[PDB]
Amino acid sequence: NSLSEANTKFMFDLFQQFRKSKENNIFYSPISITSALGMVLLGAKDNTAQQIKKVLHFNVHHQFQKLLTEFNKSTDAYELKIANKLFGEKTYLFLQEYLDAIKKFYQTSVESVDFANAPEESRKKINSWVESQTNEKIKNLIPEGNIGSNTTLVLVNAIYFKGQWEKKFNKEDTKEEKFWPNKNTYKSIQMMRQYTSFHFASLEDVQAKVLEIPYKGKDLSMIVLLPNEIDGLQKLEEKLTAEKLMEWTSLQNMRETRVDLHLPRFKVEESYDLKDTLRTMGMVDIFNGDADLSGMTGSRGLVLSGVLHKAFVEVTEEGNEEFHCNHPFLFFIRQNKTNSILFYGRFSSP
């Protein structure tokens, strides 16, 4: 929906920042994050909530719960483990009303913890919760020293996903290969090869190609963008905007063609702390003494102190023109029903 629209723009704003810092593989769940903030936005008021809404590009929670259920609908098409919880200092008493809305709309809830007296035993609490909440895939969302004795709030947003390809991949047709991060260096990888008909689309403007590899079911397909030349993605990123996607990755402007695809057998694990980032993005109150999270406790004084996001996707085999992914390229798994990107990264595996 227009929601997915907002979720997309944000993702790019988010993108732009990651770009400034990370020049390797950057992967993240725009949708997981967007929601993580909608849950917090619930218990936020005034100028503190205003920052969020603009940063997020804004009824609302209604669809964020609507869309969430979907991905939460256990299915064999794929498998995702979304571990999104609020961890706060015990001493803060959260209004049940708030707990109702978030549980209801985000199928998640707060969790009082002794940040003050026991900040160490506190970390583990959250870590372990994260593992078990993601089939034990995402571990130690928080490293030692990260959480301090002076922590009020801490939004956790881990997420794991591994879908099964509509058109399976022959485990026999996968051997060693050469991946070119840059043009002067390369790293060996196990590249999967698949010849068949896909929804291809050539990109003149940016000098790149757009392939769509669906998952079992056809409502959750991952789109990939492959710059023509090894280092043809920087320019790609440079011209990639919201509107760019809504059109370039829209199957409407795509054509089902016989394509010999060459996709690598990878897995991206990118951890992030969007505190400063979100700040510069325009969300600043929340992280300082001016934070108004009255909804969460009926009073003020609670201040978001860091936000942890961690995506972990795995691409496996199990489920004219070609698509050769031996060099960098950006991709993203969307939800075709409502074109809601729930994952996005750039693969350069340097």
Side-chain angles (χ1 to χ4, degrees), residues 92-107:
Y92 287 84
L93 273 27
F94 296 91
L95 253 72
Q96 195 68 38
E97 234 287 22
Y98 177 68
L99 299 161
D100 279 349
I102 68 152
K103 212 295 155 308
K104 153 148 128 138
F105 292 102
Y106 295 76
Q107 292 84 42

Side-chain angles (χ1 to χ4, degrees), residues 245-300:
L245 273 263
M246 176 48 130
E247 166 186 12
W248 307 7
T249 36
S250 198
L251 291 202
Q252 303 195 235
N253 308 302
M254 241 136 136
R255 244 100 190 239
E256 155 124 69
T257 80
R258 315 218 101 284
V259 181
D260 157 39
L261 155 51
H262 288 253
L263 212 152
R265 241 209 139 220
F266 66 89
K267 35 148 75 175
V268 211
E269 170 99 291
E270 276 311 281
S271 182
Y272 302 130
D273 184 325
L274 336 172
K275 183 172 149 62
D276 310 293
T277 302
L278 248 328
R279 243 143 96 231
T280 113
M281 291 220 201
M283 248 180 29
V284 49
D285 288 341
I286 13 283
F287 314 94
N288 76 29
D290 259 339
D292 185 356
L293 304 190
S294 272
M296 313 178 144
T297 81
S299 67
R300 297 204 17 186

Side-chain angles (χ1 to χ4, degrees), residues 131-326:
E131 288 157 52
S132 74
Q133 271 289 116
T134 64
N135 260 331
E136 214 196 275
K137 289 308 284 176
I138 280 144
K139 357 256 251 178
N140 307 179
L141 208 226
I142 301 147
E144 304 194 20
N146 239 211
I147 267 305
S149 6
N150 256 23
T151 321
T152 12
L153 219 17
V154 171
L155 185 16
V156 146
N157 204 8
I159 183 152
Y160 167 96
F161 177 97
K162 174 156 142 199
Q164 291 246 317
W165 295 123
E166 168 113 321
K167 276 162 281 201
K168 203 228 155 203
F169 268 70
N170 225 118
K171 1 155 204 208
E172 197 250 18
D173 320 339
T174 310
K175 257 105 229 241
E176 189 117 277
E177 197 73 313
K178 292 198 184 60
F179 189 92
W180 301 95
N182 49 21
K183 276 181 137 212
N184 0 300
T185 316
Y186 82 107
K187 334 277 279 123
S188 73
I189 61 162
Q190 323 314 304
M191 172 94 41
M192 314 191 304
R193 296 107 54 188
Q194 160 154 145
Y195 194 132
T196 175
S197 0
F198 280 119
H199 239 110
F200 179 92
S202 90
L203 255 320
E204 28 115 36
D205 273 347
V206 90
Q207 295 130 68
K209 316 257 231 44
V210 170
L211 187 62
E212 108 107 89
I213 316 100
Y215 279 89
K216 188 236 228 93
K218 278 193 107 237
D219 32 35
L220 244 256
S221 54
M222 96 116 88
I223 286 73
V224 173
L225 258 56
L226 179 51
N228 298 349
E229 263 235 331
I230 311 292
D231 351 286
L233 113 157
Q234 170 153 327
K235 177 251 224 278
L236 175 59
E237 285 166 336
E238 255 103 41
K239 331 249 69 215
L240 244 196
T241 82
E243 324 266 317
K244 278 12 214 319
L245 273 263
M246 176 48 130
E247 166 186 12
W248 307 7
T249 36
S250 198
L251 291 202
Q252 303 195 235
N253 308 302
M254 241 136 136
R255 244 100 190 239
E256 155 124 69
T257 80
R258 315 218 101 284
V259 181
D260 157 39
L261 155 51
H262 288 253
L263 212 152
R265 241 209 139 220
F266 66 89
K267 35 148 75 175
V268 211
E269 170 99 291
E270 276 311 281
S271 182
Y272 302 130
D273 184 325
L274 336 172
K275 183 172 149 62
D276 310 293
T277 302
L278 248 328
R279 243 143 96 231
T280 113
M281 291 220 201
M283 248 180 29
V284 49
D285 288 341
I286 13 283
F287 314 94
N288 76 29
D290 259 339
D292 185 356
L293 304 190
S294 272
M296 313 178 144
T297 81
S299 67
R300 297 204 17 186
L302 195 41
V303 171
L304 215 206
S305 345
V307 175
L308 277 280
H309 182 265
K310 192 154 171 178
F312 191 7
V313 76
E314 248 156 336
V315 163
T316 190
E317 9 234 15
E318 15 151 285
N320 79 149
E321 173 66 284
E322 69 122 31
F323 215 91
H324 224 53
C325 298
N326 46 109

